[PDB]
Design a protein around this ligand. Sequence first.
Ligand SMILES: Nc1ncnc2c1ncn2[C@@H]1O[C@H](COP(=O)(O)OP(=O)(O)O)[C@@H](O)[C@H]1O
Lengths: 442, 109, 109, 80, 85, 96, 96, 96, 97
Amino acid sequence: FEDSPSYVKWGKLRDYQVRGLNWLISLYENGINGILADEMGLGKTLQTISLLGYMKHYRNIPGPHMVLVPKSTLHNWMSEFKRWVPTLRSVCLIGDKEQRAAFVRDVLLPGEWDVCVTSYEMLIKEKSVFKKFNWRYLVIDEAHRIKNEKSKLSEIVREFKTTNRLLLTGTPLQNNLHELWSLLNFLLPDVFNSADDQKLVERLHMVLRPFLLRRIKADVEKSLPPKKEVKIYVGLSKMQREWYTRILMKKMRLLNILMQLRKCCNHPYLFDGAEPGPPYTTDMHLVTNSGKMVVLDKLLPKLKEQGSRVLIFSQMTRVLDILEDYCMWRNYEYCRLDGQTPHDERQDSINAYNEPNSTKFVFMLSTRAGGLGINLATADVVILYDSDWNPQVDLQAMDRAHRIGQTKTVRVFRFITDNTVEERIVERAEMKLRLDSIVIQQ
Amino acid sequence: TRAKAKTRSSRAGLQFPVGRVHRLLRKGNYAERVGAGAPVYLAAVLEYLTAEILELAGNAARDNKKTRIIPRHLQLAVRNDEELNKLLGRVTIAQGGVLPNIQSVLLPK
Amino acid sequence: TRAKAKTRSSRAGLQFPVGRVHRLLRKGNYAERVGAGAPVYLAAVLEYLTAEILELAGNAARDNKKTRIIPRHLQLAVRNDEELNKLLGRVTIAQGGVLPNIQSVLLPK
Amino acid sequence: LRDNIQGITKPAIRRLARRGGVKRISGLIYEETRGVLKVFLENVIRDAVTYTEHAKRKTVTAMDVVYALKRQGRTLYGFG
Amino acid sequence: RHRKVLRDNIQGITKPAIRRLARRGGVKRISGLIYEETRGVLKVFLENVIRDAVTYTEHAKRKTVTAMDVVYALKRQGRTLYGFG
Amino acid sequence: RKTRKESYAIYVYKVLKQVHPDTGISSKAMSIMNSFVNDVFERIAGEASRLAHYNKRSTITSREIQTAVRLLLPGELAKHAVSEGTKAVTKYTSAK
Amino acid sequence: RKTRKESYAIYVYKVLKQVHPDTGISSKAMSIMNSFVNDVFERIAGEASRLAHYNKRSTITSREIQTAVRLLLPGELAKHAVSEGTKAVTKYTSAK
Amino acid sequence: PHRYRPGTVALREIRRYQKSTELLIRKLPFQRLVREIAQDFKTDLRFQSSAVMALQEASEAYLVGLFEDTNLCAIHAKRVTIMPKDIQLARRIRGE
Amino acid sequence: KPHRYRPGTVALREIRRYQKSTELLIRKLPFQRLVREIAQDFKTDLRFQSSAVMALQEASEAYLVGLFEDTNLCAIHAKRVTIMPKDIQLARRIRGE
DNA sequence: CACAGGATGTATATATCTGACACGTGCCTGGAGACTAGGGAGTAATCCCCTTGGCGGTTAAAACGCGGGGGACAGCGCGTACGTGCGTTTAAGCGGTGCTAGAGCTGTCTACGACCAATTGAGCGGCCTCGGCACCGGGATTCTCCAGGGC
DNA sequence: CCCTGGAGAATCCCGGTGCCGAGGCCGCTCAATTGGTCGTAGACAGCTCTAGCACCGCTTAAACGCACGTACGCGCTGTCCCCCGCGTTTTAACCGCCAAGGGGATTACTCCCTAGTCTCCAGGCACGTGTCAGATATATACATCCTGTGCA
Ligand SMILES: Nc1ncnc2c1ncn2[C@@H]1O[C@H](COP(=O)(O)OP(=O)(O)O)[C@@H](O)[C@H]1O
């Protein structure tokens, strides 16, 4: 099927989505369940909509279909459903006890619907009702949620009786081959059992080529100039050395040695008693006794004398609070995004930062907050204060700014404290990135 | 030959482990020498007390429309009986609750 | 031959019998074995408690202008000290009387 | 042997109350005090006689009384 | 330097919780001063029990307090607890 | 194969089946019953040991158990338990 | 012939003469002090034996005695008693 | 004719009795009471004098403590006179 | 105009409801935080089993319920219906604390 | 002041579901059978002490009655603090990541400290005896309470 | 008026008695010293599984805060009866003494009970496993309370 079907409304499918649809059709005809990994920004939802519309239209086989999406994407999925292919009938399940009961008794039992869109929490709550019916296609968006066994969602989703299955994700491999095996075992319980060049690489490619489709965003637009990764090493200050040595040797309660060396590489003031006395001043005390703060204080004014518009991704909200104090001291306007920021406050902050003429300079983001949204295309510089164990999580934080709207190349500064646990962390991240590249990219 | 072994519990007609009671008495540092009738007597007394408390607990469970004994039923049985209340006066039963008891002055009238 | 006998009490610098304490521990059915330092530790503790009680009783008796300590003085000393009172809270001293207290609401207006 | 509880007399109850530190006494408290003393003594004497019967003796001793009081939680110092 | 405290842990024992305990106890009306006294008595009781349990755990040369240690401490205090050992 | 833990659960279950045939018990209730049996055992054994010490004897006998039962149990329970123990001892010493 | 009765009387008298040199004591107070010493001995020894049973060890040691003293005596009394006992143990080890 | 107001003699007797340390119950009536109570359990019982004296000491101490608690209850109820309901409340809170 | 119960009907209803149940009335995580904070003073780097905090909560709740029963008895003795710190202190004094 | 009706809380059946109880199986370790040795206690007999019974004289203490004041108890008013219902807010509870060491548990080896036995001599308990503290009585002082200028 | 004067109670200072605490003496039994042994606990090593620490997302019950009105706590009065102080008579405690016998305390002897060993085997653990009893929800039907209303 080299052309878009007739049920599509408001737009013709392009080459990548039509060939993805052909791949999905071939996979269904042969009778296997697969993973679509076209990366965020290649119309995976549009491909799924085209697949379901084709299933309803071309063959007279409409039936109970379940689309599992994160709660933050239910509205967008339903809007796309009602805007692209209105012929299919869709419902969404959300709300507290009374609303859920009303909705199920209204629509789910009579079953005039064909496709249902539900979240993970609603699936756990409503396993009793969602279990009874037969599902001919189970679509799961952001499949990295069920990447781990012994998890309740993965157990419940395996418990369902489905004829076919289909996974949607961007990063199937993050930490090990065990999670890829978990996804493949959910898809094909019999085909993939047990445990998972000549002894590697080639065997993986041959086995996984018919069960996967990965597309790098390079053959579609041929734009968005590539990144520039610069690693900045810091020899942290004397108080940092003193605390690091004290923690390494060993009256304060201290249990997680690794997560004490972590923040110790971030800022000593996080510990109790490292701060000075009851003056509690906030002027040049923090900058001097933290090497990363020194480098940041030297670097940001240069960016401001130039393009500015920097993004700072950090792994601790306490560190973000210290950075907020520093920005206030430097008389820098900013905006802070965090897990504690209410959802209404998040969107207006994003829009204010991304407005055509904003005075806001520094945007502080915790790396694991939000997700798959936040189009900070107008941003210029990405600065990672800390790096986590997931290179793909770091890369996602990097590509939040790296979006189709950006016109100039972006630079990513990664801060590393030598002879600390930061070296191990970055080594692990690089090794995992290499493994993912050698397995999937080719 | 060797005659068939018979448990001392079977010999006394009890349902409690006379041999285990003797072993615990000897290993508990109560005296250096233990008589033969002491474990039998102690097992009989323990069996009687267990029988009493379980009689009351089953009675309290039956009229609550249940077939299982739960700590609530055990607490209800231990209370409402004078002698067992004296025996277990300073004992806290987990997940037992308290008896229904409202003072007369607090009643509305 | 053997050297002149030297008491364990004098070896530890105590006034209470380490040997008698050791014998009582062995014959008291507390454990199969008893270590060497346990009698010394226990004798020291007993000596300290006796010394504290006797010092308080002697101070009280000197307040009363006597030389011999009596049960009244012992009761006064025990009940006028918070920690000793807590230790001996559930003990009755024969012929000791009670501490003189009168509730302030009973005093003349 | 009867009526002997009335030997515990009103002046004696008043003396005990004064040592306790009470000022005014109601007239109905004497009967209750006699009852309380009766139950206390009955418990103690029951335990003491049980110790005596175990000892295969016909004489109750201060040691028996002290052991009974101790196992009732009311240790006594001064009699052994 | 920017941090703040949330609330004292004795205040985590809330007024509605104390009122529920009083309702189980059989109490109809409660003064507004009862909550501080209840917190104080709870604190004293917990301190005694936890001190004895820590003494037992130290004697065992362990670094984890155990339900058996709590039961032993309660038995020493005179509050035998059935259901944990 | 964890190390063996001893409990009176099976004997409690047999007594329960004798007393109430069609009835059961939960896990927490069985834990409570085991604790009750252990506590009663400790009380009786301690009192018997102290009786033997007071009488200056190194043997714990059925007489000590009987006197401990009288001292610890409240009245009607004491006399019924004494009857039960006497019955059991007579059966044991008359059979074998 | 009659038997002999043991007591702590001479040791109490020695401690009294060490503390208050010219202060005497009567028979009733002597009996009270003897009973007090016996009661403290019983409490501490029982606690140590229970500790040994809980930890499944057959010996009563200075560590167990120290733990029992911490469990029994309140506060300052406990600290000073522990100091005295440790001092005695050190002297006995050194001078043996 | 001099006459003290109703209550000064009560405070005088309170002071003198809290300062004294002798027994406040007649010994022969107490002995008759003890023997009469003991006749119910076992007959042909003989007592040592020390046994009766110890019983009297314990009984007097128990009654003194009970009366102190009763006085506290009467003060709580805004009264100076002690009453049987005060005694009952004290016993109920003590646990008897 | 809206329906309203008299001051004391809901109290008796709650008394019956909580004398019917066997649950734990204190909040689990706040109680755990209190226990950890108290243990900090006695020794640092202490760990608690999850059963230890449960047993502590059970004992504490039982003790508080008994204390409230005695407190209510004292309040009734004082010709009152409301319990007060005076009643709590009297109960503790008579019980020996 | 009864009563009826309305609003709300609560008991009652009935159907669904799930995880925990009750069962079964296999193995092993702890109890039973048989036997022998040694000392703890049962038994008989003797001694002497300590309990009981009685009697008489002294005197303190109890029982009885009387008169008066103060404290308990019922009633009345008030104004305040707590219960009740509603609306907002928060954090508890549940479900996830992410590598970690850490702490408890079990198995083995090996040395030293506690037991056990023989010998001995020196603390220690019992018995006399004597002088100084406590007791008791008596006389000369301060303190305090109660009536009256309504002293 | 609050502030003297009696009057009783407590306090202090001396002097004679009594008995009980302190010291000294004898014999004997228990504790110290030595030597030999072995099993108990310490030391170490390997393994597994909970547990702690810093975060995200979501849901929802419970906590918090507020305003109103109503029982209720608390103070103040009046009354009357019940308790207390005091004097008088009566009773039984208290002390001392004597007399008798039961019973506790001791000793010597003997046996029968219990401890200790070696086999032997079955009862009692742990580990799987499935099915039913209790929990939950839901819609009923029923019981309790409260207020307006003829009584006024
Ligand atoms: N109708 C469309 N056709 C092709 N590309 C689109 C379309 N709509 C959006 N995109 C591109 O896709 C990117 C985000 O993709 P995504 O939102 O994952 O698509 P979908 O929601 O269809 O899966 C945006 O940057 C946008 O440029």
